[PDB]
Structure 1
């Protein structure tokens, strides 16, 4: 909360012009609809009280039908200057704010991102705070002068027209506005209890799409639809009451509005027959208070955005001003002439200023000679990037002088000092630009010639030519998503252009494949010529090429020697322990880097309006009562325009005895047809939600029941991942609710007006009811634009500014890399030119949408001055009179307003969603493997378990390049063991994926008991085969269910004995709730070793003859692994087993051990066989490894 009138601090001379015009021109538009009614009261009062002198009919009406065109045409230059000088004065005060919010955050030291505000929010606050400030300069101030103009002019064309009918009307507007306040709140209670329950029943599909490999493995793909049904039966009983609370919520408006014109239109009839008030002045005074009375009601939402503005701007002015203390522009600095790379650190102690007690650096002493290959290889977790983060002078040391040619870092100029030092971190940084721009961030003023040879030295120039756009390829969201080595070599070239004198490299090839890390070292050795070089490395090749090696120890330099002297010490020194931490990062890198790859016209609406509304036919008895209630509220929207009209004819009758009677009908009917509005308005909106929701639940339970029939190969395809399936069941399920439900209640009750409004037109006077019906399109159009107003034109500016935000998103997040260069003037000048095409676009939407509301409020107030011109032309030529003509006119205009307050009450159909394409694509995709196929040979009794593979070839449809299996055959015998091993990670699990029929082999037969797996019912053949997954994640339920999720039915004693045989029952007996303990992702997270025990407890319940054990290791307990295997000795009692593991002691007693090699078996035998008959193979060497 800064204040008001400090938001406008970026203002200049010209923005004090666009707010003068945006205020006065928004004041003329406010004082119009009051000063239109008094040209309407004075018209009818003169048109209707001269029924004997026809000469004072022409020059009276034609005078006031030229005060409508002026009131018309003065809403060109008062609504093409309000809407088009605030939405352009909120683009010269927000856009100049986002520039200074990036000139004063990237120009701020790193410690500001540590002890002040997080880096998670300063990337957030440029997106969410710099929009809700912009909505309080432009729109919600322009919609606030406009109301106080209507409000004050609501009470001066009011209280001086008629005294005593203004005081009564002002005692009514409370009774309306306090009921419209009940209507807006009690919906918002259910609007946040309903969708919260949908987020409860929205992750129940997320606990199946993520774990699809276990759900489709077992039979239970139906029983995880049985929860998603019953978790939405809650979401109807929070949806049925939404209609019944909106049904009475409109009913208590049409009860008060009718029963407050039973008074104001009686008390008007008391005034005329005591000679105080005419007939124009008693319908004008009645409206001009009920215009200005309710126009104060929308002055609160424009006020509420002046509360969130002044506080969400206060988070931005914290960073704008914010004096630093480190001397970046230190023009009282010194300069050198010839550096040599002489770097020394003496008695340096340093830790972070976030935990000011640690001793990360403790008397650090490094001596770097000029032009060497010195390497800092110490223990992990001992800094090992903070040491790099001081030679750059990110921070400042607590105590100790950092020497550079015998000079301190607190002497030179940082703008000049950072130019000599090149730097490559572990992960590089490339911004959403082209290629040459991401190269010129090192040095600005190089030509094209110096760039092209340098990237060729870095071995990047080859595939840049292979790119289609060359060096103008837009790297970022587009740019065909270059690989990590390709991202690496550009940043290597980004330092080569700079020509540094000192080199700093921290884990260059730590995340690169064996192909490109050779290619990097081909470029590094070219770049390490004659330069002072400090490399923290990852492999021995740099260590062998290292000149001098220093060894850290707990924040202290321990060993200072060479590559050979530290190697000659043997295991006496720490250099042998450096090997112990070396290849721990070698093999775990590209195994896990593989895991990143292994884990990854009107005929369009022809039947989609009809096939959709054909499965919506067990409920026709609830949509032929809500159509009855849509006609009755169709009449009462137009019957009210008749009573208000025909009273206005009674006021000009000189018989004060027909006037007491013929008011006393139109007051008693107005109460008698007020009680039959509230009763028949909770049938129009209540029964069009019981037809509403019971379609929507019937669609959500067919989509998930038809996603789970697609093959496993369908499910990892490009768009079918986890976060994109729940979107197709959240957007497509709710956007299809508003297509059959709303647009029968709207299309009918905007026809029940026309049979009652135009009937009064084509009975009383058949000639006036053509000209009004010909101009009847432009009236109902012009009321929609008065209702698209008050929500503001040009909404949702996230889409117009999502491209420019991405450059500020990556720049703040890379604040060490950006400040490692002097690239803090280009990220300013490139944040500019991502705004200049979305700045001119917001301009020309001002000059178009300003006039598109400008004309359509002139064609309304002109078509009133042509309707009421054809009134006096009939009276002058004796074809009609006053009583029939003004009874026609006000019916056809007040009903015309009542039409347009239907289209903006049930919105979102006029291409509100074309999502009907996305639904029927998903319900009607055809599979190739039917998971429950009728007419198939059944499963026999409890079989011997003959697993056998014959001449099998495989290829994933995601990557059909590499063939996995090349004429592979393998046979499990009648129930002993077929334990398999192999090299190169747990990708070997793609043998189990062939048995489960998750995929299809390229050639061969998958025969079981001499019978193919295409000759069984697929759920029936997935009955007898258990499977332990690799990394078990669990369901957000009880442990008692996750073990009961292993059979069709479940009994108590079967769960208890099996978990005891699983040997997890002990600590389960020591848990707080034990079996009924709530686990998953919403409660107690467990250990990975106990996650293994639950998964093994799952598989034992199946009593499966065939069993497929994946990696049962990484249960870090030598006691438990032996004891579980003792039970696993009994877990194969007459059972066929494939056991796939790592440690050879598990397969020590295995019958048939085989090795995967090049799509073929390598060796066949066991422990006593392959060490006897083929002792020179792979099976003997890995025993010495373990």
Structure 2
């Protein structure tokens, strides 16, 4: 941490005033409840003493009813100035912090972004580390003066009234705090232990969706739902006991309060009888000391912030204060008037600052001339990217100056030097602004005509008109995701707009298609003419058209010559030597009321049939727990009545009766509060386990095209099965325990307030709207009115995010002072939208507190108007007021659950969209053709016109007809690999064929059952995916009823028994993501053994590669020989001539099969065939 008193370093003369008004208001607001209690204690004491006198009672109750309208106006004018002068002054400072932080973040050197601080941290330090500072001075400092004023003003009111009953209360509050603090730890120790197994069992649905290709091929979707069901019971038994320690931890706080109010009342009755204390001052002393001791523990959340945002504000001040010794642009430089471009290199050796021991360049010299197109060779391995990272002074050479027209760049203007070099990055960089500014960064002086004049050269203007708004489309998260082929054209448009002379096009050469190439190359060609350009070249056309090309020799240059100068050498043609494997890597790579929630809620509640014995047993024990909170507010209001009884021997025999009920119903709040929170947690944890294992047996039943729509991703399923049933519980299952309780609490209060006196119980109900609307706002004050704190600063913070990740493209165009003027404008609406929110959160909070204390004066006044006419008494108008103001902590708390019943509808929307989505093919479709036993194995793949459901752009196969006879081996040799996989993928009905019928043994695959035919066909995947279990179970995962004798023999045929016999852990080695990491060169032999146990008649084989261990290759071939022995096998051939012994061989030619027969048959009459020509070449 830095210090406190250092956070307020961005304060002008206007927030020194907003922190005075907001600190006087927050202090006056705090001292209003302990003063209201004093005024209330003086009102009652003037209302029960005058029983024989009437005309004075209405004279000293009217007086004190005019102090409530003043206390309610000193809260309206004090909550206006607390919530408005703190939110508004915590914004103007934390915005100037962000802007000053970013202005000095993309102004440091690039060395600072590699060693000292990482680029993935300076971008994170404005997402939450710049919010922790705002939240630590905006509102959690105003919620500290408040709760210190209430603490200090609680004891003073309690001690200047009865110093004798306010010591007992101080000797009692700790006994409540101990029990209230032990409960919080005993519950939160298990609320963190349950969400350890609830996260460990979430890995099964994560390892199943990833390997969904081999889950069904060895069909075991029944093994992944009974290994997921019996892995939630462990986290269910850890939740059955977090519903018991909650009941015994909340029922032990009602056994302490109810028993500690049985001593305070008796002791107050002991003092009243001795004439040491009034009657109403013994109820405004317990409360005024229990409020001034409970508003001290509410100052701890506001205290943790000052320590969490004091060590998280040193990071931000680290970069602001970072020294400018970063070699910033020297102002005292020189500028040359005749730049034509003669950049050369003379003895340049440079070393990275992150590892100042190794060398990259050793005596490197380059002689780039004027107005030519010299290129570079030396593809990856040397790096070939330091040269462009050194010309524009991104780093500095260790020795040897870099020349420019006879002048070094160690004295020239950096801004002018960068103004004359146009950089085109390999990856386009576009900022989230209009296209009229993203192209404007090149030279902020041109007009509208010249912008399109420069854009049309890159063939961009031909399509900008087609845009809905022309040159105003906000690219980035709003510009409809422009194609990658247009990002390059707008980038080169920006490049030509600066019309430089030291042009430095890099190698885009990554994913640009041949369609867009015809025009982007033409756009580039008009831009390389007549300027000194250095082109790093990867495409052959660029090299053949360019001038003489230099050869990089990992530190120096051997010789510089044209294509003819170097290609004519031959064997000593190092250029031609490096050319040959350059192209080899290319081809191989490729509303809620009864309308919107009436069906869904009842649909959810109907499948909970067999657990209702726990429903109406924590619900008949929840009424009798809300009725004991209205039989306590009645006792506390009936003891107060008897305090004003002139008898001193009848009061004793009345307080001694209420002090035996309070202990009596204190044992009924320890039991009947355990049946409440312990039978509504058995319901809630049998509902979740049921709704989760219905959302897995439905996921594992969809079609293969469902899993590759980019929405059913590996993490998107493990997250939508976790935060979709755990927020139906915590928002709907723990909320029916609060609606029923606070309904008994209301039906007892509004029925015990009418038996005594009903005339007062209508004026006390006609003002409920202005009381339950005042308590809700009081209960929302603690959470702060400044919500959505992260989302408000989100449209501008991503412009900041995509400005310190591309800092080299930002500082290459000198445009490091414009990305701050664009960032200032993106934070201006949040200022004049948060200025108008703190004054509707302070003018709608002040009136709803004036109107709360203006209803106690339409109360205690009408009550004193009844009494003058003998319609009631003091003991019948104070037991109706207080027992019916306790119903204002009923409906007012019940109505607070509005946010928890609007997201609970969205939850069951997603839950119930998964349980009804119709599958494409039913795995358990009835009345299918029964599969005969030990089928011959005649696979017949013909007329397989087919393209992928995902996108039918490129048709996969065009009318192939393969024919493998029962008991033989057929291969799929051919060129352009990784294009034949859509044959194994359709033998298993993963993707439905478009036009054709796939038949097995003369019967079609459509009329079979899907799961009745996968018990005969086994595949070996390309890369063997291995589950996180033991070897014995993983190998036995294949065949049901895997006996030990069969598995030990099946593993023997593959040459892996001896290799794993030497392991210390025997067979159960526990291979996985956390077990013993085995070598990847022997993973194939577990998969082959797993496929062998299936005794499958058809044994489709994908590959046997990724076995670079030469010793392992012979073992793999030994297993392959047994694999193709006595059973049909469709083996995809991604191997060399080693496949000599195949019986039928076939060739795939761009989705067409051309020749059939055998191996030796094609070599005698097909001299021009591809098959014969690849024999000796590849």
Query: TM-score normalised by the shorter chain: which range applies?
Result: over 0.9
Distance in 2 (CA, whole Å) between partners of 1:943 and 1:136 is 74
Question: Does structure 2 retain, via aligned residues, the 8 Å contact 1:746–1:906?
Answer: no
C-alpha spacing 1:142/1:431, structure 2 compared with 1 (3 Å): same
Distance in 2 (CA, whole Å) between partners of 1:1083 and 1:504 is 50
Cα shift readout 1:342-376 (whole Å, capped 9, x = no counterpart): 11211111110111110111111111111112122
C-alpha spacing 1:393/1:313, structure 2 compared with 1 (3 Å): same
Distance in 1 (CA, whole Å) between partners of 2:1056 and 2:1000 is 33
- 1:539 deviation in Å? 2.2
Question: Does structure 2 retain, via aligned residues, the 8 Å contact 1:950–1:970?
Answer: yes
Q: State the SS of the aligned residue for 1:986.
A: coil
- 1:1084 deviation in Å? 4.3
Question: Which of 584, 602, 605 is the matching residue for 1:610?
Answer: 602
C-alpha spacing 1:286/1:1123, structure 2 compared with 1 (3 Å): closer
- 1:36 deviation in Å? 0.5
Distance in 1 (CA, whole Å) between partners of 2:375 and 2:898 is 71
Question: Does structure 2 retain, via aligned residues, the 8 Å contact 1:279–1:652?
Answer: yes
* Partner in structure 2 of residue 1116 of structure 1: 1108
Distance in 2 (CA, whole Å) between partners of 1:1182 and 1:681 is 82
* Partner in structure 2 of residue 349 of structure 1: 349
Q: State the SS of the aligned residue for 1:559.
A: strand
* Partner in structure 2 of residue 1059 of structure 1: 1051
Cα shift readout 1:478-504 (whole Å, capped 9, x = no counterpart): 322223222222212121111111111
- 1:1059 deviation in Å? 3.0
C-alpha spacing 1:724/1:866, structure 2 compared with 1 (3 Å): same
C-alpha spacing 1:1031/1:471, structure 2 compared with 1 (3 Å): farther
Question: Does structure 1 retain, via aligned residues, the 8 Å contact 2:155–2:292?
Answer: yes
- 1:1120 deviation in Å? 3.3
Distance in 2 (CA, whole Å) between partners of 1:739 and 1:370 is 72
Q: State the SS of the aligned residue for 1:75.
A: helix
Q: State the SS of the aligned residue for 2:614.
A: coil
Distance in 1 (CA, whole Å) between partners of 2:309 and 2:363 is 51
Question: Does structure 1 retain, via aligned residues, the 8 Å contact 2:90–2:137?
Answer: yes
- 1:194 deviation in Å? 1.7
* Partner in structure 2 of residue 893 of structure 1: 885
Cα shift readout 1:467-488 (whole Å, capped 9, x = no counterpart): 3333222221232222322222
Larger mean CA deviation between 304-313 and 732-741 belongs to 732-741
- 1:740 deviation in Å? 4.9
Larger mean CA deviation between 356-365 and 537-546 belongs to 537-546
Distance in 2 (CA, whole Å) between partners of 1:162 and 1:497 is 84
Alignment coverage as a number of residue pairs: 1176
C-alpha spacing 1:247/1:690, structure 2 compared with 1 (3 Å): same
- 1:713 deviation in Å? 1.5
Question: Does structure 2 retain, via aligned residues, the 8 Å contact 1:379–1:554?
Answer: no
Question: Does structure 1 retain, via aligned residues, the 8 Å contact 2:977–2:1134?
Answer: no
Question: Does structure 1 retain, via aligned residues, the 8 Å contact 2:23–2:145?
Answer: yes
Question: Does structure 2 retain, via aligned residues, the 8 Å contact 1:509–1:517?
Answer: no
Give me the TM-score of the superposition, normalised by structure 2: 0.97
Q: State the SS of the aligned residue for 2:980.
A: helix
Larger mean CA deviation between 445-454 and 341-350 belongs to 445-454
C-alpha spacing 1:902/1:721, structure 2 compared with 1 (3 Å): same
Q: State the SS of the aligned residue for 1:365.
A: strand
- 1:707 deviation in Å? 1.0
Question: Does structure 1 retain, via aligned residues, the 8 Å contact 2:731–2:904?
Answer: no
- 1:1032 deviation in Å? 2.7
Distance in 2 (CA, whole Å) between partners of 1:571 and 1:188 is 74
Question: Does structure 1 retain, via aligned residues, the 8 Å contact 2:746–2:890?
Answer: no
C-alpha spacing 1:628/1:1003, structure 2 compared with 1 (3 Å): same
Distance in 2 (CA, whole Å) between partners of 1:586 and 1:1100 is 36
Q: State the SS of the aligned residue for 1:978.
A: strand
- 1:619 deviation in Å? 0.9
* Partner in structure 2 of residue 647 of structure 1: 639
C-alpha spacing 1:910/1:1122, structure 2 compared with 1 (3 Å): closer
Larger mean CA deviation between 1155-1164 and 69-78 belongs to 1155-1164
- 1:1152 deviation in Å? 2.2
Larger mean CA deviation between 502-511 and 127-136 belongs to 502-511
Q: State the SS of the aligned residue for 2:241.
A: helix
Question: Does structure 1 retain, via aligned residues, the 8 Å contact 2:501–2:533?
Answer: no
Larger mean CA deviation between 124-133 and 441-450 belongs to 441-450
C-alpha spacing 1:1146/1:1042, structure 2 compared with 1 (3 Å): farther
C-alpha spacing 1:486/1:1100, structure 2 compared with 1 (3 Å): farther
* Partner in structure 1 of residue 1067 of structure 2: 1075
Cα shift readout 1:702-744 (whole Å, capped 9, x = no counterpart): 0101111111112222422222222221222012214552333
Larger mean CA deviation between 943-952 and 249-258 belongs to 943-952
- 1:186 deviation in Å? 2.2
* Partner in structure 1 of residue 1040 of structure 2: 1048
- 1:61 deviation in Å? 0.8
Larger mean CA deviation between 577-586 and 549-558 belongs to 577-586
Question: Does structure 1 retain, via aligned residues, the 8 Å contact 2:92–2:831?
Answer: no
Distance in 2 (CA, whole Å) between partners of 1:836 and 1:1108 is 64
Distance in 2 (CA, whole Å) between partners of 1:828 and 1:1120 is 59
Question: Does structure 2 retain, via aligned residues, the 8 Å contact 1:505–1:534?
Answer: yes
Q: State the SS of the aligned residue for 1:179.
A: helix
Cα shift readout 1:645-681 (whole Å, capped 9, x = no counterpart): 0001100000111100000000011111101111111
C-alpha spacing 1:1069/1:431, structure 2 compared with 1 (3 Å): farther
- 1:379 deviation in Å? 4.9
Question: Does structure 2 retain, via aligned residues, the 8 Å contact 1:988–1:1156?
Answer: yes
Distance in 2 (CA, whole Å) between partners of 1:369 and 1:950 is 63
Question: Does structure 1 retain, via aligned residues, the 8 Å contact 2:985–2:991?
Answer: yes
Question: Does structure 2 retain, via aligned residues, the 8 Å contact 1:328–1:415?
Answer: no
Cα shift readout 1:571-610 (whole Å, capped 9, x = no counterpart): 12422321234224433555xxxxxxxxxx5222112121
Question: Does structure 1 retain, via aligned residues, the 8 Å contact 2:377–2:575?
Answer: no
Question: Does structure 2 retain, via aligned residues, the 8 Å contact 1:349–1:400?
Answer: yes
- 1:15 deviation in Å? 0.8
- 1:461 deviation in Å? 2.2
C-alpha spacing 1:284/1:14, structure 2 compared with 1 (3 Å): same
Cα shift readout 1:862-881 (whole Å, capped 9, x = no counterpart): 11111111101111112111
Distance in 1 (CA, whole Å) between partners of 2:692 and 2:1032 is 29
Distance in 1 (CA, whole Å) between partners of 2:612 and 2:400 is 86
| Unaligned runs of at least 5 residues, structure 2 | none
Cα shift readout 1:248-307 (whole Å, capped 9, x = no counterpart): 121111011101111100001011111011111111111111111111111111111001
Question: Does structure 2 retain, via aligned residues, the 8 Å contact 1:738–1:909?
Answer: no
Larger mean CA deviation between 1140-1149 and 640-649 belongs to 1140-1149
Cα shift readout 1:66-116 (whole Å, capped 9, x = no counterpart): 111111122211111111111111110111111011110100000111221
C-alpha spacing 1:203/1:562, structure 2 compared with 1 (3 Å): same
Larger mean CA deviation between 524-533 and 1039-1048 belongs to 1039-1048
Cα shift readout 1:503-523 (whole Å, capped 9, x = no counterpart): 112312233222333433222
Cα shift readout 1:413-452 (whole Å, capped 9, x = no counterpart): 1111011111123222112222222211221122222222
Distance in 2 (CA, whole Å) between partners of 1:784 and 1:921 is 35
| Unaligned runs of at least 5 residues, structure 1 | 591-600
Question: Does structure 2 retain, via aligned residues, the 8 Å contact 1:1148–1:1167?
Answer: yes
* Partner in structure 1 of residue 616 of structure 2: 624
C-alpha spacing 1:1044/1:924, structure 2 compared with 1 (3 Å): same
Q: State the SS of the aligned residue for 1:680.
A: coil
C-alpha spacing 1:837/1:264, structure 2 compared with 1 (3 Å): same
C-alpha spacing 1:461/1:23, structure 2 compared with 1 (3 Å): same
Question: Does structure 2 retain, via aligned residues, the 8 Å contact 1:383–1:555?
Answer: no
Cα shift readout 1:1076-1096 (whole Å, capped 9, x = no counterpart): 223333344444433333333
C-alpha spacing 1:978/1:86, structure 2 compared with 1 (3 Å): same
Cα shift readout 1:392-432 (whole Å, capped 9, x = no counterpart): 11001001010011111211011110111111232221122
Question: Does structure 1 retain, via aligned residues, the 8 Å contact 2:746–2:891?
Answer: no
C-alpha spacing 1:895/1:151, structure 2 compared with 1 (3 Å): same
Q: State the SS of the aligned residue for 2:694.
A: helix
C-alpha spacing 1:1000/1:318, structure 2 compared with 1 (3 Å): same
C-alpha spacing 1:930/1:353, structure 2 compared with 1 (3 Å): same
C-alpha spacing 1:1065/1:540, structure 2 compared with 1 (3 Å): farther
Distance in 1 (CA, whole Å) between partners of 2:429 and 2:324 is 26
- 1:534 deviation in Å? 1.3
Q: State the SS of the aligned residue for 1:847.
A: coil
- 1:987 deviation in Å? 2.6
Distance in 2 (CA, whole Å) between partners of 1:105 and 1:628 is 63
* Partner in structure 2 of residue 320 of structure 1: 320
Distance in 2 (CA, whole Å) between partners of 1:1070 and 1:407 is 70
Distance in 2 (CA, whole Å) between partners of 1:546 and 1:1177 is 38
- 1:1066 deviation in Å? 4.2
